[PDB]
């Protein structure tokens, strides 16, 4: 109890009349809040998913995207997706951790040829149209698009280059339309029995069967370099808490305190504020554009007001410089003054000479 704390701090079994500072009142953070500015721009993976005509397998479109927040959660949320196999990276860790740049390649190919477009796997089309490097870190997204990309008559929009003179370089797209010299006799630009044109036309039809239907296949390439990383998943955010002492993480400021609305007006470029002593005084909420004042958690000295143990064993506790809305247990004749909020003493309007000085004109005493 406070009286025994006073006895220990005085190292005497009898404490004389007076006020003794025994301990320190401290308010610990109840909650922890983390905020980052929300999505705003979004990296358009759905756009290359939603492209009406996917690029040719040999002339695969290379889309390098940077400086945007990427939402990979919608990719898992999307039901029509059928294949999400990943190599060197967790499918669900794209949101958690990020790379510097992302390459998206959109192409339409038959179902059996989808497995041919994979690292460490070579195919009749893959070796000459699109050969994924063995060691790249990325995910291949594939799904059936027979209804969207085929008709009863037949879809000949998508074609591939069957014959190529040399092995394809990694991350290289071949757009050459030269007639392949399959035969020993020179082609000279004229199709013949020996010379076969490398490009062949697929026919996509619903009746053509599964394993050969068109598949909208998108491969995402992630590479992290010395340059700063600009595309990342949505970092965790929490709700805003006002008038309660909480740990706050406003884009990595990492401070503790109680957050209140402030009348101060920041400049548009400015993010947080500092006082004369170079202490964070106000922060702007990244989610909104409002300005939040940061005042520290309430703390102060705990002083025990006691008459002599010869007189009595009752004690009144003073919490210096603390609003006792934030605070012997409260509810026992709790009275508030400038020196602090006094617990255990009842304010009396009549005035006597000072007995135990509390502060700011308030003096405690033991009387009936």
């Amino acid at each position, epitope marked *: 109890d406070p009286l025994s704390e006073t006895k220990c701090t005085l190292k005497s079994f009898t404490v004389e009349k007076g006020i003794y500072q025994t301990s320190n009142f401290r308010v610990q953070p109840t909650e922890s809040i983390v905020r980052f500015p929300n999505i705003t721009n979004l990296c358009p993976f759905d756009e290359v998913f939603n492209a009406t005509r996917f690029a040719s397998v040999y002339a695969w479109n290379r889309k390098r995207i940077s400086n945007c927040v990427a939402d990979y959660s919608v990719l898992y949320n999307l039901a029509p997706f059928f294949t999400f196999k990943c190599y060197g990276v967790s499918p669900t860790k794209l949101n958690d951790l990020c790379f510097t740049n992302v390459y998206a390649d959109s192409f339409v190919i038959r179902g059996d040829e989808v497995r041919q477009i994979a690292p460490g796997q070579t195919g009749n089309i893959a070796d000459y149209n699109y050969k994924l490097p063995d*060691d790249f870190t990325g995910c291949v997204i594939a799904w059936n698009s027979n209804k969207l990309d085929s008709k009863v008559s037949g879809n000949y929009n998508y074609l591939y280059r069957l014959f190529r003179k040399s092995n394809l370089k990694p991350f290289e797209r071949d757009i050459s339309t030269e007639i392949y010299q399959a035969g020993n006799k020179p082609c000279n630009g004229v199709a013949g029995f020996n010379c076969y044109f490398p490009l062949r036309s697929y026919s996509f039809r619903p009746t053509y069967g599964v394993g050969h239907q068109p598949y909208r296949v998108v491969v995402l390439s992630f590479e992290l370099l010395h340059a700063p990383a600009t595309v990342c998943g949505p970092k965790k955010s929490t709700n805003l808490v006002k008038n309660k002492c909480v740990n706050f993480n406003f884009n990595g400021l990492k401070g503790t305190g109680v957050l209140t609305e402030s009348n101060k007006k920041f400049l548009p470029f400015q993010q947080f504020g500092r006082d004369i002593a170079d202490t964070t005084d106000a922060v702007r909420d990244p989610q909104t554009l409002e300005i939040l004042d940061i005042t520290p958690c309430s703390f102060g000295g705990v002083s025990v007001i006691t008459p002599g143990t010869n007189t009595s064993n009752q004690v009144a506790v003073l919490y210096q410089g603390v609003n006792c809305t934030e605070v012997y247990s409260t509810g026992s004749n709790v009275f508030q003054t400038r020196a602090g909020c006094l617990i255990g003493a009842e304010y009396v309007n009549n005035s006597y000479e000072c007995d135990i000085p509390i502060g700011a004109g308030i003096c405690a005493s033991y009387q009936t």
Partner: antibody
Framework: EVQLKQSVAELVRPGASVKVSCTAS????????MHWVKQRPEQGLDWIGR????????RYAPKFQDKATITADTSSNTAYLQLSSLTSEDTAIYYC?????????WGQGTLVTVSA | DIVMTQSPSSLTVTAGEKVTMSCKSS????????????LTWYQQKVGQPPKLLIY???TRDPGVPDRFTGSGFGTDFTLTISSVQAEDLAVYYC?????????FGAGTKVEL
């Protein structure tokens, strides 16, 4: 492509700790929060837990609580196993995981048993 | 923690014989956002580490790809193989994924 190497099996004194390393080759471990699993010969497979390279916050199976601990080091893509005072039946072959939709990448396996 | 019961029946059959293997999954696991459920199967050749056989319970990964369709609402999923050969001769475990407590398959073998 992407390979996870298991540490060679070390004979361990009875009632002591045993450590097995799962280093990643061909790719940094930073993008992978690998999972540890234990398999006993002629017995069902079990899931030990997982490690994240940064803020690892490893969460273990309820049966293995307070006795099975696993950690990894981001530098050199190394991982580790921490298991001590294992009985012969409890000891099982440990594998690493790709934590995908299914565990695509698995270690070659470590047959570790208390033999001293 | 999720209750699982995998049929360990083993059949010594010639190639071209279908086999049906299913294991119950309690709580009827259902991923939010997408209709796909996170249930997977593994194929482990004797003396070799297991590898991903099937993921999402209805999607066939590249690598010996053939059918393996499974129909269920999270209460149960059935994995079917059209033909049995030495390559498919292995031990299979079905492990739930949507539920964070992960319990692996008891084990199922096939013979030629």
């Amino acid at each position: 492509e992407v390979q996870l190497k298991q540490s060679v099996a070390e004979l361990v004194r009875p009632g002591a700790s045993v450590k097995v390393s799962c280093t990643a080759s061909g790719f940094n471990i930073k993008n992978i929060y690998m999972h540890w699993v234990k398999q006993r010969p002629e017995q069902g497979l079990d899931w030990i837990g997982r490690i994240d390279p940064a803020n690892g916050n490893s969460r273990y199976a309820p049966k293995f609580q307070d006795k099975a601990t696993i950690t990894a080091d981001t530098s050199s893509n190394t991982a580790y196993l921490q298991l001590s005072s294992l009985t012969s039946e409890d000891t099982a072959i440990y594998y690493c995981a790709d934590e995908g939709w299914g565990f695509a990448n698995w270690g070659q396996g470590t047959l570790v048993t208390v033999s001293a | 923690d999720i209750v699982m019961t995998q049929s360990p029946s083993s059949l010594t059959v010639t190639a071209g014989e279908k086999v049906t293997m299913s294991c119950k999954s309690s709580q009827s696991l259902l991923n939010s956002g997408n209709q796909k459920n996170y249930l997977t199967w593994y194929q482990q050749k004797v003396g070799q580490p297991p590898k991903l056989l099937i993921y999402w319970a209805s999607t066939r990964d590249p690598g010996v790809p053939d059918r393996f369709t499974g129909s269920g609402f999270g209460t149960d999923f059935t994995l079917t193989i059209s033909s049995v050969q030495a390559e498919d001769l292995a031990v299979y475990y079905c492990q739930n994924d949507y539920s964070y407590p992960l319990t692996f398959g008891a084990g199922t073998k096939v013979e030629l």
